[PDB]
């Protein structure tokens, strides 16, 4: 998985990372007891697929969703909170 850091400091993570990954390498706290992926923890929150545009805040994380396909996050912008 890639993940690009942005000029304002944003980063931009694939919806395949890994979430244990994540955690490890930026020092964030997303909840791994239930999903496995970035993607598995935005769905596993929304009561729908969420469109591209959608902002939304999980486990610390200010996310705007850039890209979906096949009815999973493929990128999603990401702000610390």
């Keep these: 998985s890639n ?4 000029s304002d400091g944003s980063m931009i993570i694939d919806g395949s990372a890994n979430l244990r990954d994540l ?3 930026f020092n964030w706290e997303l909840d791994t ?3 496995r992926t ?3 923890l935005i769905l596993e929150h929304l009561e729908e697929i969420p469109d591209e545009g959608t ?3 999980i486990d610390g994380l200010l996310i ?3 890209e979906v396909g096949d009815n999973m996050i493929k990128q999603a912008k990401v702000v610390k909170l």
Excluded: P, S, W, Y
């Design 64 to 66: 705007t969703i850039l």
């Design 3 to 6: 993940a690009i850091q942005q």
């Design 55 to 57: 902002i939304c805040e």
């Design 23 to 25: 955690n490890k390498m």
């Design 33 to 35: 007891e239930d999903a």
């Design 38 to 40: 970035f993607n598995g």
